């Protein structure tokens, strides 16, 4: 290696944060978003109503939590689906949120809790 | 056999032969057998790393019916390059036209003798390079004698390095404390998932460190006050009871606290002219004692070998995807019977899979 | 190479190919020196006065 080491990257997070959700013939707690251009999505990310991620100063606009890893350059998810899917209604999720820079986690959690989403405190 | 006299061509004197001086070679590590041979058919290789951890559990109220959960594991991947070595040599008729053999009177040199000598020199050079590379790998960073950096294990695997200070200069300093620190580090930082005995380790040190350790008052008095063969042998016997390196028939050895200390004098010269001591530590004055510690093979068994060597294929035709060999030697004939030219090739990289188990030892204190 | 310390010869001749069968090459070698061990017996003769 030029620097003495090479790193091929870590495995993307797997969709296992869901501990409980409302089962229904059609997904009652799941919603579909049109993927925004040139945006990379990963499990545990917070999205606004329009499908864009939540940045600092707008935590009150948090709408849903992403569930599928989406590759922008392919315009296709890792499961071959055309759309992004996120949780937007009552459910229990592992406390493994991924947030942008300078985003206050507490505000996001309070905003989401109003929709019935609770976070189980994960161990180590 | 008779030759011309010193100051007259008409008188003869008797020649009694030759005496040869051969440079020293050491090759100590190469004989321990620590490094296994792992030939491969490619110019690179990969590895997978898996990690997980656990923590204590917090009490919750019975009626609330709340609970806890554990985070998932982390998987990662890495890669390695490899080092290539090559050298050339040739034989021409001018080397055998009228050139007397050193040990005789009127016998001429022949192609066979030059061939054998040059091949032996090539093999010696490659052995020296292999020993140097093994020692560099054991230090934790693989760098060519030219100074190029090829592998940095402490960065390839995200981990740091530990140094242990003995403070042998202080008359009141305790050594058992440092030995226990080393043992606990080796026992705790493995994270192999099984029971580990840290008593199984090699400790190779230099001359100054060995002398300071042996002559410390606390060790000397303690071993002097005991009536047992080990005490007698070390205090007033000969400490040279170890194995053989490439030069001397026994290596200085010392026993204390269940640890075995060995003195290694190996050193080589770069073609730039400088001297590369094998046991030294980078950027530390040679006046300070220095050593290196690493686990034994039995500390984990062959099922979990830690040291390996990889061998790649030769660039020439007919070896596109072969398994690879330690050394290749080829010969070709020059144009219109002008001479012979040789070539020797090598392609290897030694590495370690758990670099955090390599600990450096120092005689000073900080 | 094959003649480094062999006895001399009146005339050496060698043949070599030119690769890819485009022709053949020839060479001739000789390493000679004539001499006389009684030079005092060699005399010049001239048809002119002193």
Automatic annotation (TrEMBL), chain A:
This is Uncharacterized protein.
From TrEMBL, chain C:
It is found in: Virion; Host cytoplasm. It comes from the Viruses. Belongs to the lambda phage major capsid protein family. Homomultimer. Assembles to form an icosahedral capsid. The assembly is primed by the interaction between capsid assembly protease and portal dodecamer, and major capsid proteins assemble cooperatively to form the procapsid with the help of capsid scaffolding protein. Major capsid protein forms hexons and pentons of the icosahedron. Viral genomic DNA is packaged into the procapsid through the portal vertex. The packaging triggers a dramatic reconfiguration of the capsid shell. This is Major capsid protein. It comes from Escherichia phage JohannRWettstein. The chain holds residues 317 to 366 of 368 of the full protein.
């Amino acid at each position: 290696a030029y620097q003495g080491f090479t790193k091929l990257g870590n495995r993307e997070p797997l969709n296992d944060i869901i501990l409980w959700e409302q089962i229904t013939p059609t997904g009652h707690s799941r919603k579909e978003y049109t993927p925004q251009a040139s945006t990379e999505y990963r499990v545990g990310e917070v999205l606004k109503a329009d499908g864009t991620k939540v940045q600092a100063g707008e935590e009150a606009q948090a709408d849903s939590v992403c569930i599928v890893n989406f590759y922008a350059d392919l315009q296709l998810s890792y499961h071959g689906q055309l759309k992004v899917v996120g949780i937007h209604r009552d459910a229990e999720l592992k406390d493994l949120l991924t947030l942008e820079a300078s985003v206050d986690a507490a505000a996001v959690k309070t905003a989401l809790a109003a929709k019935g989403i609770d976070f189980v405190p994960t161990g180590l | 056999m008779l030759t011309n006299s010193e100051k007259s061509r008409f008188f003869l004197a008797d020649l009694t032969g030759e005496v040869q001086s051969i440079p020293n070679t050491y090759g100590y590590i190469s004989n321990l057998g620590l490094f296994r041979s792992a030939p491969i058919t490619q110019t690179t290789f990969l590895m997978d790393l898996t990690d997980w951890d656990v923590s204590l559990l917090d009490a919750v109220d019975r009626d609330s019916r709340k609970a806890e959960t554990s985070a998932p594991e982390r998987v990662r991947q890495i890669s390695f390059p490899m080092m290539y070595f090559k050298e050339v040599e040739s034989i021409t008729p001018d080397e055998i036209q009228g050139v007397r053999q050193p040990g005789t009177a009127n016998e001429l040199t022949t192609e066979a003798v030059v061939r054998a000598k040059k091949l032996m020199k090539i093999r010696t050079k490659f052995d020296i390079t292999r020993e140097f590379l093994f020692m560099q790998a054991l230090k934790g960073k693989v760098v060519d004698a030219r100074g190029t950096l090829y592998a940095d294990l402490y960065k390839q695997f995200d981990v740091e390095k530990k140094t242990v200070y003995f403070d042998l200069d202080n008359p009141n300093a305790d050594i058992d404390a440092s030995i226990e620190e080393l043992r606990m580090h080796m026992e705790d930082e493995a994270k192999t998932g099984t029971v580990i005995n840290g008593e199984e380790i090699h400790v190779v040190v230099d001359r100054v460190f060995f002398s300071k350790l042996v002559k410390h008052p606390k060790i000397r008095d303690a071993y002097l006050a005991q009536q047992t063969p080990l005490a007698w042998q070390q205090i007033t016997g000969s400490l040279r009871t170890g194995g053989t390196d490439g030069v001397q028939a026994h290596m200085n050895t010392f026993y204390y606290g269940g640890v075995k200390f060995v003195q290694y004098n190996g050193k080589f010269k770069d073609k730039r002219g400088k001297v590369h001591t094998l046991v030294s530590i980078d950027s530390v004055a040679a006046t300070v004692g220095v050593g290196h510690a690493f686990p034994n093979v039995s500390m984990l068994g062959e099922a979990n070998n830690i040291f390996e060597v990889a061998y790649g294929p030769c660039p020439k035709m007919g070896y596109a995807n072969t398994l690879g060999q330690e050394l290749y030697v080829f010969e070709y004939e020059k144009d219109r019977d002008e001479g012979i030219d040789f070539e020797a090739h090598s392609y290897m990289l030694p590495y370690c899979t758990r670099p955090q188990l390599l600990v450096d030892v120092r005689a000073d204190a900080k």
